[PDB]
Write a protein that binds this ligand. Structure first.
Ligand code: NAG
Lengths: 48, 48, 48
């Protein structure tokens, strides 16, 4: 019916009504970070 | 679940509202006739 | 050591700790919130 990997991670699936092998990939994430000189110099800021 | 003409309708392990959206492998309907309120006597893990 | 360490972390995501299933979406989509409270309590304590 479906496939997986190391953890309880459904890494594929067989679709009803079309019988095709669909891969599943996580939607992107990742923590932002804020780089700044001191507020006593400027309020400009860059974001990584 | 809304035709409440029954006497007792108690679901264990499943909330009645969320029954409309689950594809079960199979169901078993087991039926009998018993006198009195022996519904309390027949309880998962209980005695009687 | 480092690799092996976090490997156990991942394997910890497939352990019941006492709930009805190790996967969160099952509990969210099969139980009414007053009992999902209990199940999620167990899972959260374990992973913490
Ligand atoms: C659903 O209908 C299509 C054709 O209309 C068919 O290809 C498909 O096999 C059907 N689904 C199943 C489980 O048979």
């Amino acid at each position: 019916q479906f496939g997986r990997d190391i953890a309880d991670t459904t890494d594929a699936v067989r679709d009803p009504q079309t019988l095709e092998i669909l891969d599943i990939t996580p939607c992107s994430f990742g923590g932002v970070s804020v780089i700044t000189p001191g507020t006593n110099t400027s309020n400009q800021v860059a974001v990584l | 679940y809304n035709s409440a003409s029954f006497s007792t309708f108690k679901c264990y392990g499943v909330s009645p509202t969320k029954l409309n959206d689950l594809c079960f492998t199979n169901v078993y309907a087991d039926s009998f006739v018993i006198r009195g309120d022996e519904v309390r006597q027949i309880a998962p893990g209980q005695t009687g | 050591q480092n690799a092996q360490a976090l490997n156990t972390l991942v394997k910890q995501l497939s352990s019941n700790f006492g709930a009805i299933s190790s996967v969160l979406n099952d509990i969210l989509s099969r139980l009414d919130p007053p009992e999902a409270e209990v199940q999620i309590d167990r899972l959260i304590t374990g992973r913490l």
